[PDB]
Design a protein around this ligand. Structure first.
Ligand SMILES: [Mg+2]
Ligand SMILES: [Mg+2]
Ligand SMILES: [Mg+2]
Ligand SMILES: [Mg+2]
Ligand SMILES: [Mg+2]
Ligand SMILES: [Mg+2]
Ligand SMILES: [Mg+2]
Ligand SMILES: [Mg+2]
Ligand SMILES: [O-]
Ligand SMILES: [O-]
Ligand SMILES: [O-]
Ligand SMILES: [O-]
Lengths: 386, 386, 386, 386
């Protein structure tokens, strides 16, 4: 089975299946896809909805009449298919004017233009029903040390987000923001490089409750971090507003492989976490079909994204349901991890001799954790060898 | 010149110059140093003070009389040399009982013991005059996915730090805590893996003002991150309580090279930031003299740490003082980065046609940033070619 | 399920299940294992043989009488179980005399001592039946640039291996040598860091036929390289003499996880390669049971190594046997890669206008490669969803 | 200061200063440069020559008449300046027909076309005076495991290079070939990923003498390797035919920063090696002026490449000439590494009791190597603090 239906909340950006295959060393290997045809083809595949950057839907520099016309025909395909727009974003990285950033460009006039460009697209995203507005500052950063004073750049980043927070509050919009972290590329180093850095930054904004994170699998893996661990921290903070799924095979350039490819065990632990934590947002795929592929390989790749999530969902649920796994978890004391360390308080802990002076350190040091047996049960379930 | 004096606030852990050279594949190549002799030799080198883990000063398992005796003779060398103890920490990673962690061990009784072990050493660190108490959770984490539920582990981590916050508040101690992030090693992945992750975690503690970060050069570089950028975020947050200086040559095992070795340009931008931001805490070295070295190579390595900071301090100050550099910074518009984007407010920005409808995008896109000329002036000053 | 047999050629080092758990930040968590108990327990698990470093078997410093006793007891356990010894190696990294190397130490006398220690163990390995003698220069390298002139050190490395070749040739021994590459750890950089570098060096020895490589999964992955691609090149060269199997989750310290853990798709493509190329040597596991484990967890991790190889062997055989995969391989023109580019020579090619002057570049550019549809069939077979 | 002369052999690719700034997330920021203006401007800066890909000089698709005109104008600028063309290469990566490779494309016809396109440019390079023809197989590789059988692809790679060797031998051309390794990007994994892998492959060609390597600083650093060590092995092998100089700050996308930027101490040890080994080929810069720059910044970045090499050349010469460094090298026994381990052979060594039976292992283990004191002298010379 593993057939996606709308109920599975699978979404795709216009820019993913529509990537023409232009990379740093080569030209486009595929023609551009029309936005109406992408909506059509994804609804046929079992997708729930689509997302967009403003310049994906409306070619940069369009007159107001060309814009209207682009939004009308898109909105029509959405009505015709039952497709939703859960999220939208701004392109603040392609046009040469953003070569030193959008919100943190050294030129003040470019920072003002970046904000107006964003605000215009927040109005459109709300009209189309988007609840989450993503911000990926891919050009915010530097290749050299004196080019960007980072404390002042963070003053300008906080100013920009506070300004957008005031704007949606004044308009009464029901939209929240999600910051997408990336450690590098296209800049040598990008500001707010990981989930952690974006979550700490949010706590310094004027209205923190309006902002969360949109982590991407491949981005945290570009810094060699454990993506399931970063998502668990964002969930613990109540800040996982959206998530971008794809694959990455290690620390190198950002590959955007289809979900499931790259680190397959990390994809298994991520699905197990999303499903057991009850995440209810879109399962969004931000990937690129390899430029070796024609348009049928594009839809084959898009279908494999959804198929791999559904296969892993089944294996993670079977794992957690297994009495032998529930037994191995008690053996590794994951139940004791859930008990408070000292709900009796610091003064009872300090007067407790079994916690220190009479604690038998070597009896405790000799208890094996039985983590390898547990992990081989997880490997067996992933591989269907049970 | 480049001669360290106490005034330069250079500090060293007992565990740094005293590392015997035991690594994963080999035995100790040097004898243990007595703590009194380390104090002596570092005061002679121009060091301001020393730090310790409890088990560095008092051998694990010492009776109360062996403990008293170890603290008396140490305290005596400190009085005799004028050496200070600015910071202290707990060893919650060497003894086998901490094989699954201290504060986040799955076994509850080990988590209670880890807290009592810590509290006993907070009392001693306050008595010796330490103002900062560092927490490096090196055993908090996992090699496999089901071994550690990370949301619950963070419940236990927050519980532990809140418990220590209540303890020092109740005792009226003037000590703050600093969390030291590390992405991996000795665990496959460590919780709170970077500066960003530790800063976001602190905002969820009961008394956030009691906690900051103690970043280490080599640790952020093990995730390929820009260490000067991470320190700028911690300074912007008002959370840089302490800093550990050393060298790392890339993403690999944690090398702990002497400061200045590893990424030399990153060391130059770090000193430029510390000195221009007015950091006033200790310049602490957490490094390991290579096990190829005898005890004279140990003191040669320790002296090079301080010499390299003083050379880079001089080159960074000369750079910033140069009128030609001040001119290149105006040319790259670092002065415009300091201007507010929209102090006129969102409604004036929205009614400003020069910010969007009449903005000349291509005139702005054509302005070069002159960042390469600026960076070659920084290279010239670093190398003393001006 | 999936039982290990004799004919599977699974072997283990004495140092793998015998690892006591000591790492750079912690003490041993397990008791030392007796070599004869290791032989017994591994025979019980379905292993075909065991390997050893000389100091695993005979304690460094044992007179020629305890050496006698140690070899006698050990050979007894092998006699009793039918266990074989396919390979042996020298420990030229643990003792402090090897702190700057064995074969390439700057001190001449340490290099002579290193060669005498190796030759003593080549005699023992041959009489126990080993056909392959592994060299892992863990200490050959540097933490700094002027400490080691690498061209001269390669002269010394070549000299050591040529002298070893002369010795086994004058003795008439059947044994061949296999270099084990590793990019770093315990040295900042190790000489002959990858499979590629070791294959090139072998070509400069006086008897290249006596020497091949012994690549390890996690070591090539410490440099972010594709381990199956590196094994395909060692097999193309006719130099894959032995292989070390384990797991690694990224570029970081050497983990030595059990085979299957780490990069699970790389383990699948490795098994598919080994089995389709008909590699017939030992499937040797060089891994470390995590120090979180007691001795039951050690045997559970050793059994998981074998189980994972056998599950992947079955999934890879099913992938290649599937008629739809054979069809997808023809569709991606994997059969056409096996056809010679220009079997009728360079003047044939130059005289062919369809190769240049009349080649339709756009029709060729538009053929899709259908690689994503082939990779999802491989993904379905691995996960048993086919 | 530090002026570039002719005799310094500094060369640049047409594609380096000519890079228009287009990357995977952004459009070109600079106008295209005319090849004759590039020749003029670089002659003015003190460059000795220029290099080119065939499609840098002649637009893909130009008839044999625009080809004529393009070569004529270009040769005119060279005639007028005295600029030389030391090396040339083929673009087998930009056009979509090369999406799965040139020499190792699965389609036979694309491989024939790739060889005809290369041979056409070998004829042009020879008449312009190039002695080295570089091959960079940027598209040779895969993003997935069954897309490319690597043993067969190495058969095709060897076949392509053997046919090129036959062609230049039957023409009597003086030119030699140089393989440029790169571990990844634009392919997930590229074949012959490091200097080591390319040196081993060369040993399997029918005429190994015609082929060497062209390593690039940032490409070996993309795999975390030590670039000076890799160059020492290519020089030991007699295969350093050419070298590409630039900067890279870590394992991430290929940056191509100007030489000196990135890992500055690695650039110091590289210059020290090149100058002490008497390398006499071009010092070629393969870098990209950041897209933040206008054309004045492009020429400022190109001048910085040359300046940095000349400052490092001077600092490295001063380090080796210093009597205290010569003394520190004797103290670290760098003179003793040059002495043969056992010049009087294996039976000499076996008969020597001072090599084993009477060698005092503890006195040898306790000699310190004094490597930190030597490295701080190197650090003092680099920073001009001596
Ligand atoms: Mg991405
Ligand atoms: Mg994304
Ligand atoms: Mg460290
Ligand atoms: Mg530290
Ligand atoms: Mg290993
Ligand atoms: Mg091994
Ligand atoms: Mg490059
Ligand atoms: Mg190059
Ligand atoms: O992305
Ligand atoms: O450390
Ligand atoms: O290993
Ligand atoms: O490049």
């Amino acid at each position: 089975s593993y057939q996606p239906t709308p109920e599975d909340r699978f979404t795709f950006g216009l820019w993913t299946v529509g990537w023409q295959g232009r990379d740093p060393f080569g030209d486009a290997t595929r023609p551009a896809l029309d936005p109406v045809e992408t909506v059509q083809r994804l609804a046929e595949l079992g997708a729930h909805g689509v997302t967009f950057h403003d310049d994906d839907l409306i070619p940069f520099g369009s007159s107001d009449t060309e814009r209207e016309s682009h939004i009308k025909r898109f909105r029509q395909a959405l009505d015709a298919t039952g497709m939703t727009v859960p999220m939208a974003t701004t392109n603040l990285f392609t046009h040469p004017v953003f070569k030193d950033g959008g919100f943190t460009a050294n030129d003040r006039d470019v920072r003002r233009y970046a904000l107006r460009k964003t605000i215009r697209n927040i109005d459109l995203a709300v009209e189309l029903g988007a609840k989450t507005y993503v911000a990926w500052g891919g050009r915010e950063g530097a290749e050299s040390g004196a080019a960007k004073d980072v404390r002042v750049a963070l003053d300008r980043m906080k100013e920009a987000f506070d300004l957008l927070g005031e704007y949606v509050t004044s308009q009464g919009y029901d939209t929240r923001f999600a910051i997408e972290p990336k450690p590098n590329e296209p800049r040598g180093d990008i500001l707010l490089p990981t989930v952690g850095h974006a979550l700490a930054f949010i706590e310094r904004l004027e209205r923190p409750e309006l902002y969360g994170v949109n982590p991407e699998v491949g981005h945290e893996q570009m810094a060699g971090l454990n993506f399931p661990h970063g998502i668990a921290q964002a969930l613990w903070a109540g800040k996982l507003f959206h998530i971008d799924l794809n694959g990455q095979s290690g620390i190198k350039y950002d590959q955007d492989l289809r979900f499931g490819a790259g680190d397959l065990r990390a994809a298994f632990w991520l699905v197990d976490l999303l499903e057991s934590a009850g995440y209810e947002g879109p399962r969004h795929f931000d990937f690129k079909p390899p430029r070796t592929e024609d348009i049928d390989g594009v839809w084959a790749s898009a279908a494999g994204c959804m198929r791999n999530y559904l296969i892993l969902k089944e294996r993670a649920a079977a794992f957690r349901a297994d009495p032998e796994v529930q037994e191995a978890l008690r053996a590794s004391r994951l139940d004791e991890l859930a008990q408070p360390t000292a709900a009796d308080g610091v003064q009872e802990l300090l007067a407790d001799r079994t916690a220190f002076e009479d604690f038998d350190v070597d009896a405790a040091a000799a208890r094996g954790m039985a983590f390898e047996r547990l992990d081989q049960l997880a490997m067996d379930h992933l591989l269907g060898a049970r």
